[PDB]
C-alpha cells in the first residue's frame, strides 16, 4: 500500500556511487510531504515538477537511485554538471525531471580509522551517458604504454575510496543521495499521492 521509501532512505548501508543503486517503486501510495518531514535534508529540489504538488500526481513507476558521495560533490547531482561524479559515476540528463534529495550521513557512514567501503571512479575513457552505470574494474591506461594487467604510473586501478573519517570537513563528509525519477508511460498509473 504505502511506498517502501524506508527501505531506500533508511537502509543501513548505501551503495558506492560508481555502483549506484536503483530501486523500482510501483503499485503504492506515496506521501512526499511525510517524506520531506522524514529527516533533516540538506538538499530536496525538483526539476520539471513542483515539490509541493507531488502529492497530487500519479506516475507509472518511480525509480529511486541511491548512493553516497562527499559533500562538495552534491552539486554535481544535477542537469548540466561536470566533474568526476557527473562524468564518471552518476550522470543526469539535461532534461532531467525528478527530484534530488541529499543529507549528511557522517554519523552513519564515517568510522574512526576510516570507512573505506564507499568508492568512486576516478578514471574513464569517456563520460557516462545519462543514467548509465559502470562497475568495471579494468586497469585504466592513462598513458601511451599498455598496462597489460600491471598497475603503476599511468596504469591505474580505476576506483578510489573516500575513506570517510568522522572529523573530516563538511565538504569531505559523506552525504547520502536519493534521486527520484517519476516515470510517465502510456499505461495505468501505479504510484499516486494520498
Amino acid at each position, epitope marked *: 500500500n504505502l511506498c517502501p521509501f524506508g527501505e531506500v532512505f533508511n537502509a543501513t548501508r548505501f551503495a558506492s556511487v560508481y555502483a549506484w543503486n536503483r530501486k523500482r517503486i510501483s503499485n503504492c501510495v506515496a506521501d512526499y510531504s511525510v517524506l520531506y518531514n522524514s529527516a533533516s535534508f540538506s538538499t530536496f529540489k525538483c526539476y520539471g515538477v513542483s515539490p509541493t504538488k507531488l502529492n497530487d500526481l500519479c506516475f507509472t513507476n518511480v525509480y529511486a537511485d541511491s548512493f553516497v558521495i562527499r559533500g562538495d560533490e552534491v552539486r554535481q547531482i544535477a542537469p548540466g554538471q561536470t566533474g568526476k561524479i557527473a562524468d564518471y559515476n552518476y550522470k543526469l540528463p539535461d532534461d532531467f525531471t525528478g527530484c534530488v534529495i541529499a543529507w549528511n550521513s557522517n554519523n552513519l557512514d564515517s*568510522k*574512526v*580509522g*576510516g*570507512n*573505506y567501503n564507499y*568508492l568512486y571512479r576516478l578514471f574513464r575513457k569517456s563520460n557516462l551517458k545519462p543514467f548509465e552505470r559502470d562497475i568495471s*574494474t579494468e586497469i585504466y591506461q592513462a598513458g601511451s604504454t599498455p598496462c597489460n594487467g600491471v*598497475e603503476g604510473f599511468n596504469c*591505474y*586501478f580505476p*576506483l*578510489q*575510496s*573516500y*575513506g*570517510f*573519517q568522522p572529523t573530516n570537513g563538511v565538504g569531505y563528509q559523506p552525504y547520502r543521495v536519493v534521486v527520484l525519477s517519476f516515470e510517465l508511460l502510456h499505461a495505468p498509473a501505479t504510484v499516486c499521492g494520498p
Partner: nanobody
Amino acid sequence: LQLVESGGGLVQAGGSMRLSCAASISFSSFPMGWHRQAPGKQRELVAKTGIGGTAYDDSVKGRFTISRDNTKNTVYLQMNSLKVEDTAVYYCWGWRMNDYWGQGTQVTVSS
C-alpha cells in the same frame, strides 16, 4: 599473492624487530596494515593506516608503530618492547573491494 612480507623470527622478551610488506597493486586511498593470529585464537587487527587515519590495537599502543610509503605501496611495523603475548603469526593486510593478505610471518617472543 599481492602482499609480500619480510622480517620476523625469534626474539627475547623486551627485544625488538621490524616487519615489512610490499604490494604489487596500488592501495592509494585504501588502507594497509597488520593483523596477527595467536595459536587457537581468531585473527585480530594490530595496526592499519591510510587516508582514513591510523588505528592500533590497545595491547600494542606505545610499543608498535606502523608506517607506510605511499609511493612504493609498502607498509611497515616496528615492534618494540616485545612481550610473550605478542607471539603470533603476523599477516600483512590491505583492503581494495576485498581483503588482501600476505603469506603470514611467525613472530616468537620467549623469555
